[PDB]
Write a protein that binds this ligand. Structure first.
Ligand SMILES: OC[C@H]1O[C@@H](O[C@H]2[C@H](O)[C@@H](O)[C@@H](O)O[C@@H]2CO)[C@H](O)[C@@H](O)[C@@H]1O
Length: 358
């Protein structure tokens, strides 16, 4: 590979996360633990554009990044997540979003992307790296018999295409979400997954800005497992390095020099789940390996922190329309607030259990 988006750039630290972390650390009673938690705001994370109201935030982040770059004599990089599909989260309930297909979803999303493009277009000196629509494509590999997913398949593909095609015109480096090793990493899923991703890549014109795929976003898999998690029984690809070593060659066969980024933001503590599919607020997770480009794998551009640890995965209140029974499992921290909202006790455990220690 030739073009790693991080080379020669300084990552712009998320002010949104920083404000959450500064607030959470002053509430942590242990003094050294509070110091460690406070330091989390200096670790680069991805900022989620999980609703239109966040688009002005992206405005202020690019402008701050531009200024930081001019004043420090560096080139700055802003890390974002495109996550506002119509009928979002089609195989769960916890992260249902603000747009729906039956309520002008297609148009709302295209306007969402347009407004994002118009922001990024005003700051050519700032590089952007985007993860494209967590969970969407993977749902279209394994969840087509889910009627919500099946009904939204063509909307998902159209919208993902619209994001890819139009963010490319303002030079955004993009990694399409590709699930994780327990999802698409199953050997029998590798080829169907690859066929989808290469179709999506081809449909977006094979633009050089489509770098490749992101894995483990908002999940907890090891990148390189010391020993296989017991939940991984039956899958030889028990960790993300196995998944990626098995999937990436298929992408290259079709001529896509595809590279990867891997969430490790909540991967510090392994063996914390009853079943692999337990994804919601897993009790006892720690912050994992810090973001770095020294990945040890020919396919991986960066270890990253995509899901901001401490922001909730979903509510445990079964009276909310966004209740998902996954968020009430014995390995899920409860009680838990609405997804995307701050979960103070979960953040403290992420700090305490961080591996490597903070
Ligand atoms: O990993 C985060 C997403 O997981 C999704 O559920 C997956 C799960 O990850 C797999 O381990 C397996 O259970 O397949 C599931 C899909 O049916 C979930 O739908 C999303 O809400 C999560 O963000």
């Amino acid at each position: 590979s030739a073009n790693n988006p991080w080379t020669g750039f300084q990552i712009f630290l998320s002010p949104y996360y920083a404000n959450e972390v500064a607030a959470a650390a002053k509430q942590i009673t242990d003094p050294t633990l509070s110091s460690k938690a406070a330091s989390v705001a200096n670790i680069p994370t991805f900022t989620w554009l999980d609703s239109v109201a966040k688009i002005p935030d992206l405005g202020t982040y690019l402008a701050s990044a531009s200024a930081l770059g001019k004043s420090t004599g560096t080139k700055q990089l802003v890390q974002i997540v495109i996550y506002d599909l119509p009928d979002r989260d089609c195989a769960a309930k916890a992260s249902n979003g603000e747009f729906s297909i039956a309520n002008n979803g297609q148009a709302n999303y295209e306007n969402y992307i347009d407004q994002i493009v118009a922001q990024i277009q005003q700051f050519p000196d700032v590089r952007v790296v985007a993860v494209i629509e967590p969970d969407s494509l993977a749902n279209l590999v394994t969840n087509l018999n889910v009627q919500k997913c099946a009904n939204a398949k063509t909307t998902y593909l159209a919208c993902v295409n619209y994001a890819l095609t139009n963010l490319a015109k303002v030079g955004v480096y993009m990694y399409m979400d590709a699930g994780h090793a327990g999802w698409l990493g199953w050997p029998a899923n590798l080829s169907p997954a690859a066929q989808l991703f290469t179709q999506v890549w081809q449909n977006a014109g094979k633009s050089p800005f489509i770098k490749g795929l992101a894995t483990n976003v908002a999940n907890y898999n090891a990148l390189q497992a010391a020993s296989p998690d017991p939940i991984t029984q039956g899958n030889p690809n028990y960790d993300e390095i196995h998944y990626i070593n098995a999937l990436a060659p298929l992408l290259q066969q079709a001529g896509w020099d595809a590279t990867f980024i891997v969430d490790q933001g909540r991967s510090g503590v392994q063996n914390i789940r009853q079943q692999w599919g337990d994804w919601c607020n897993i009790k006892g997770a720690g912050f994992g390996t810090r973001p770095t480009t020294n990945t040890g794998s020919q396919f991986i551009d960066s270890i990253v922190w995509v899901k901001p640890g401490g922001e909730c995965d979903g509510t445990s209140n079964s009276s909310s329309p966004r209740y998902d029974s996954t968020c009430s499992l014995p390995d899920a921290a409860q009680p838990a607030p609405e997804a995307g909202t701050w979960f103070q006790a979960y953040f403290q455990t992420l700090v305490s259990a961080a591996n490597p220690p903070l």
